Amino acid sequence: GKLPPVYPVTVPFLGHIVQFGKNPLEFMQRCKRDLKSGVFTISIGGQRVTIVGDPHEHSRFFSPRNEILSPREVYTIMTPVFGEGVAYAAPYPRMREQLNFLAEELTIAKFQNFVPAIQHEVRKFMAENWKEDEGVINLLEDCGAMIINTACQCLFGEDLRKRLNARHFAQLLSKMESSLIPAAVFMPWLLRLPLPQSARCREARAELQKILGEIIVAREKEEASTSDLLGGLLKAVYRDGTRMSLHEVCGMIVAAMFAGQHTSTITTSWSMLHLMHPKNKKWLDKLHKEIDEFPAQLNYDNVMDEMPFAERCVRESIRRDPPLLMVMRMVKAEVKVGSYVVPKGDIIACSPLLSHHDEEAFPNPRLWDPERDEKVDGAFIGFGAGVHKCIGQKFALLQVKTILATAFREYDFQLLRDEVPDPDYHTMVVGPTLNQCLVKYTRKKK
Amino acid sequence: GKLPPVYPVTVPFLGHIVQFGKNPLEFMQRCKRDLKSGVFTISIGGQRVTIVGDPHEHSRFFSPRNEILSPREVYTIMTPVFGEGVAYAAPYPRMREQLNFLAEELTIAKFQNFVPAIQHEVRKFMAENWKEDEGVINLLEDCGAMIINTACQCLFGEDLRKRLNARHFAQLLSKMESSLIPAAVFMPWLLRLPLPQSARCREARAELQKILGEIIVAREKEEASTSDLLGGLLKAVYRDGTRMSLHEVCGMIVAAMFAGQHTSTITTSWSMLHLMHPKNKKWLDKLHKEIDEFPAQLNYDNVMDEMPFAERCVRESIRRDPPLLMVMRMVKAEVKVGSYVVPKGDIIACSPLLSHHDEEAFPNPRLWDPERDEKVDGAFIGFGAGVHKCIGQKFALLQVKTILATAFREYDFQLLRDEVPDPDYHTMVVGPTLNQCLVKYTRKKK
Amino acid sequence: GKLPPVYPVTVPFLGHIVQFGKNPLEFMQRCKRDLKSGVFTISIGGQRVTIVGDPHEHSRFFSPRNEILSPREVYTIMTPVFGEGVAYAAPYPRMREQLNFLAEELTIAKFQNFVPAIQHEVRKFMAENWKEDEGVINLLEDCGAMIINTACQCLFGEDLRKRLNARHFAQLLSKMESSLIPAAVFMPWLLRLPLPQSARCREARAELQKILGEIIVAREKEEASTSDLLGGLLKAVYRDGTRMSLHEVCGMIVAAMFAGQHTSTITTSWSMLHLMHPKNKKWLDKLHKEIDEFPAQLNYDNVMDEMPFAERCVRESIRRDPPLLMVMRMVKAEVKVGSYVVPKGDIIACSPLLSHHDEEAFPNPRLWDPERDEKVDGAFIGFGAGVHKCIGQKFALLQVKTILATAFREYDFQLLRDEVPDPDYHTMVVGPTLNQCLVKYTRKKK
Ligand SMILES: O=C(N[C@H](Cc1c[nH]c2ccccc12)C(=O)Nc1ccncc1)c1ccc(N2CCN(c3ccc(F)cc3F)CC2)cc1F
Ligand SMILES: O=C(N[C@H](Cc1c[nH]c2ccccc12)C(=O)Nc1ccncc1)c1ccc(N2CCN(c3ccc(F)cc3F)CC2)cc1F
Ligand SMILES: O=C(N[C@H](Cc1c[nH]c2ccccc12)C(=O)Nc1ccncc1)c1ccc(N2CCN(c3ccc(F)cc3F)CC2)cc1F
Numbered sequence A, B, C: 001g002k003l004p005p006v007y008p009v010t011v012p013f014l015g016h017i018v019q020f021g022k023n024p025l026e027f028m029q030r031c032k033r034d035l036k037s038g039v040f041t042i043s044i045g046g047q048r049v050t051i052v053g054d055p056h057e058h059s060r061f062f063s064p065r066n067e068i069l070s071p072r073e074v075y076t077i078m079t080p081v082f083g084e085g086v087a088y089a090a091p092y093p094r095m096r097e098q099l100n101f102l103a104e105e106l107t108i109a110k111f112q113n114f115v116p117a118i119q120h121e122v123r124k125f126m127a128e129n130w131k132e133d134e135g136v137i138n139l140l141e142d143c144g145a146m147i148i149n150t151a152c153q154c155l156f157g158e159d160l161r162k163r164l165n166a167r168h169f170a171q172l173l174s175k176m177e178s179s180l181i182p183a184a185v186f187m188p189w190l191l192r193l194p195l196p197q198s199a200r201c202r203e204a205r206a207e208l209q210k211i212l213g214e215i216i217v218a219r220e221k222e223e224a225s226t227s228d229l230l231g232g233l234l235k236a237v238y239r240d241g242t243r244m245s246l247h248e249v250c251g252m253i254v255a256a257m258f259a260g261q262h263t264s265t266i267t268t269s270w271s272m273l274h275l276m277h278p279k280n281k282k283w284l285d286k287l288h289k290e291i292d293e294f295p296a297q298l299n300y301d302n303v304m305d306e307m308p309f310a311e312r313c314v315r316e317s318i319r320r321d322p323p324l325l326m327v328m329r330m331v332k333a334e335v336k337v338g339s340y341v342v343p344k345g346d347i348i349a350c351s352p353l354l355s356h357h358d359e360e361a362f363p364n365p366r367l368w369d370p371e372r373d374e375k376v377d378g379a380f381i382g383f384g385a386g387v388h389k390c391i392g393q394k395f396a397l398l399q400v401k402t403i404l405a406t407a408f409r410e411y412d413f414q415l416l417r418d419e420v421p422d423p424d425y426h427t428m429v430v431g432p433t434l435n436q437c438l439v440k441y442t443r444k445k446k
């Protein structure tokens, strides 16, 4: 085998994470240029990280099975929050079955009544918060509130929402996030030591599990028709003929809510931010034309089948600013990538950021252009690819499209600074800088 | 409960400590503004830190007992230097009794002969080091030398000083400080691992303990009158009727000397730095008027009761540049703070820096103005507040005021750069940048 | 004892390593100036580091035996790569004997046929890569390739090179380097925890050991004349009458190749970079005069005895940019350094960088001047000094001088930017910034 070339080891401890939090794109482009190779290795905290930064080789990265490019070792930071024996922390066979059970709950087939539930919360929100003829809001925080409120209406039954509302859900997820050390992907030794915040999060999730249990007992003693997410997952049956444990169900619900909270929020925000920008009026007008073709009450078919332009807007906002900068796996057995082999124990990564800004794939990559197409097949990896592709993608897109169509139909927006906000690359999920997201809404003439 | 809002988690490991060491004020003001709340939470190394940045809520932070906002877990870094079973490392009841025994040794009631002892060392120092009609000194280092020399004359008997002089004391404290990892407040897992520097410091303190023991044996075999600090503490009796161990006494002496070495030094320096600045001549003239009302030999009453203006100068230098930027505690049981609850396991903090620069409390907070008053009651927290307030405050103020009155009576000073020195926020105790503290003394016409 | 003075402890974890990776010279000069002492102590991660930054006191640092200023504890990071019981990881007596056995293999006495072997590889390389009349290359990478290719021809027999060629060797060393955490010199607690990359490197070296074993078995079953490095080391006999183990031999070969890969490469590059710079034409002309005094085929005597000017060029490039910025040891028993004592447990360091830029020793230290002499005796410490001085120095100098003489005889070079490249201080071995090393070769008129 030929090893990819290697950026030589630097002295500050985890110093490359600082660069990755400040200018990740430029850092990776430098690595690529200096070593004259799209496939290259860096060393972070003693751990080799090999980045497939050539769009043409995406298939090598996304094809292999979890047994061989495993996500388990790279997501050890998440075990306290989701639970032992849940998702990435489960043996491979159970892992695959659990993920699939969640994927089954979020198929287009399961979305009956979701668009009206979403429209209802959004309208409730706009009437509570956007009351005036005119007013100033933080668009990032309000999208975030709408994402959690709308997800909770779609996924959880009324009895569940009565005991556990979106605000409590939001707090719990936010507390959990605050307990993580994202750098510890490169500090596996740390995660073997006792961490107090870890015990705290497990009690928090155990409290959630208690609520969930009480709900099931109450539903079981009043029935004659549990087709919400909780209900669906409790009815799943593994290949061996057993059921998921409530522990496992609770964990998968947390993971689903945790996954969508920032990614979908960010995507909504960027999309709305580009569309209200004056130099994009042409695309806004185009969006209104599409929306006005439709009544007030939307449905699944309108949003998902009959809004191709709104789709290009959302996709191109994920293209330009992907909220997850890296997809990563642990190499469990060595793998070929072009003329190279990437050895076992390496972390192998593919970067939606680096790849969405490749000039060959996306000519003039700093331009937000909803009409563009990829020049390289598979270079859009906003939701990953292959067999492990985002299983929440259709649910996320339904939410974002519905919120977009409801909001722009009822309100005009103006960004209260000249340029679109800069991404803030310091956070785990990357989105627009919070203090640059002030916007003025104006209620449209009824 | 409602959780305070949370700055979302950042990727560089302990990256917020870098900002806290470079621009802490601006970092915290940003957190406050971006989240629209004076009470807010950040995550450092996986550990939630909730900052009470509203001056009006100081009472919630400073009221609770050590059983419930505990200092023990946040000061684990200090256990090697002070000893197991000493101070913050003692069970709560013993902790309280030990701290109180030290507080009792440093009451105004115990200061007979301190002002003359201080004046004597300062005069000895000025005659050894400031010999000429005119000359250049580093004011920060010389204040530091005067603080340790004067503390040793007040607190330790001649026999003790003969075996352990201020220079040796200074070295030992300085060696101990060099062994600490202040960031490990956010790395409790680290402090459970063996650290070699920790064993070294304990041998150093054990050597100190040996000297102290020999002194006691020598005093016990020559007496007919141990009213120094060592003597006082050895005579303390716990509620159960036993005595502190020599181990515990030794530890409390170290902690007392360690506490005052930089804080008091820094406060002296800032005070002298502002007063010699030309735009402050008006306050200098005012200070001389007050000093000239008094003979050469001062006494307790002059310094502590009859120098109200010198007091405003020292207080306002602590206001403008508090040497401890944060008071912190571990939440052992949850607590209310305004409309929020701060959960167990959080670190809860209140910042004298952030609070002394609040515009409502201290209008035009960058101005050093000794005549100002707080506009918010309890917003001055230079020495903390409540039941856990600095127990060295009266001793520190006596030293600083005495040094100020002795030095300015005998010398004029001029700062050898245009602007007052910038604080250097990189160190544990924060003071003026060392290389900006060059000053020229001029011996006054006798 | 008097302790050296101490820069007071800073809050960011390992924050001084960031400064050391960005501007080490300025950082250390600041420490020296601010504390008014050439001998001074900083605290990194809780570990005191005392730097002998006075050229006049070099002898204190370099005299003491390994039992008392030990390299073992500071080079724990290297144990996985070289092996347990090898070099710095061996008990002191074995350590001394092993190092000596390697030193014996690299004495001038052992270099018969090295200059022709080197000239042969360099010429092979130039003909493969520098084929045209004219062309653009990265001088740093090509010197690196020449250093490893030429070392392998000198040190390893044909049978060994047939199974393990320079490219495979280069990869293996590069993989090993990528597994290190240089900051962990200041994190001894980390190196006591399991690190996965450590197990990987040991398997890699075990694979190398297997190849080496097979070679020995094959040589042992075909002989009638193992005078390469492998052969030499296998014939070494300890004081007790036993032989090195193949494990130990394998480890010492790795350490030798690892030591020379960047240091010698960097030194070649800098030397060539200065000599092709136009303002240095005067020294280039001088170098050609010396080279032209000699045939095409060089020999040991020409290179090592008859090239005094080429020697000054190489030495002065190591003077101006020493590839190892610090020589460090663990104080095992306390030691005097001027008016100070440096206690046990301190890391004591001497910096070739700081010392080669001292204005007293090297007037106008930013000027590359091959005719200069030190103004302070022992201030050149590019290869260390004393009893522990670099044991590869004569081999490194032979390689560098031979490559210099062969290349400049056959080619002209031009740097494709105006100024000599900046050093990149981020890496373990420090050399010229990689992307500033583009050069244009021109084949000379035959
Ligand atoms: O937000 C993250 N993850 C969280 C938690 C999570 C993890 N895996 C999941 C699988 C399913 C559901 C949730 C999760 C998350 O919400 N991820 C997510 C995944 C899929 N779909 C939506 C959201 C996350 C985000 C960033 C991150 N980093 C920071 C960048 N990094 C990195 C990588 C390479 C470098 F050179 C430098 C770097 F700094 C280490 C990985 C690590 C992370 F875990
Ligand atoms: O100088 C410090 N402490 C030392 C040692 C010490 C500790 N507790 C004591 C109680 C009694 C006597 C001595 C001590 C000290 O001398 N403190 C002191 C306390 C009271 N009166 C005078 C002096 C010190 C100083 C700073 C520090 N940091 C750095 C800032 N930090 C922090 C906190 C929040 C953030 F967002 C970011 C930050 F970086 C962690 C706390 C931690 C510390 F321990
Ligand atoms: O390149 C390094 N070493 C490697 C591996 C190695 C170690 N010891 C050996 C002995 C014999 C052979 C190989 C080795 C190496 O190739 N060193 C080498 C030594 C002698 N002759 C040639 C090369 C190396 C290079 C730098 C380094 N640092 C970074 C700077 N540092 C440091 C020190 C003081 C500070 F204030 C701040 C700092 F960041 C910690 C030491 C540590 C290292 F181990």
Ligand code: HEM
Pocket: A062, A071, A099, A102, A106, A255, A256, A257, A259, A260, A263, A264, A267, A318, A323, A324, A327, A381, A382, A383, A384, A385, A386, A387, A388, A389, A390, A391, A392, A393, A395, A396
């Ligand atoms: C805009 C929103 C989202 C973005 C941009 C996003 C992005 C991604 C990406 C990049 C992957 C990696 C896929 C691969 O390995 O090739 C992924 C996987 C995943 N996403 Fe999302 N995601 C989003 C929303 C969601 C939501 C709402 C859920 C809720 C269930 C979710 C759950 C997952 C899961 C479970 C996986 C792992 C699939 C596996 O390992 O097989 N994501 N997502």
Ligand code: HEM
Pocket: B062, B071, B099, B102, B106, B255, B256, B257, B259, B260, B263, B264, B267, B318, B323, B324, B327, B381, B382, B383, B384, B385, B386, B387, B388, B389, B390, B391, B392, B393, B395, B396
């Ligand atoms: C200018 C000098 C000093 C400053 C600015 C200062 C500042 C502080 C502050 C802010 C606190 C926290 C009090 C609270 O929890 O509300 C404190 C506590 C303390 N200080 Fe100081 N301090 C100084 C000098 C000293 C000295 C000379 C000693 C010597 C004994 C000392 C010993 C203590 C102790 C023991 C506590 C803890 C009290 C407790 O937990 O109950 N300090 N100081």
Ligand code: HEM
Pocket: C062, C071, C099, C102, C106, C255, C256, C257, C259, C260, C263, C264, C267, C318, C323, C324, C327, C381, C382, C383, C384, C385, C386, C387, C388, C389, C390, C391, C392, C393, C395, C396
């Ligand atoms: C330009 C190339 C090199 C430079 C600048 C360099 C620099 C140094 C320095 C500064 C030392 C520390 C000596 C002391 O403690 O006083 C040293 C030691 C050493 N070098 Fe090198 N070195 C180079 C090449 C090599 C090579 C090619 C080898 C191959 C064997 C090597 C092996 C060693 C060893 C084994 C030591 C440790 C000697 C001991 O601890 O007794 N070095 N080198």
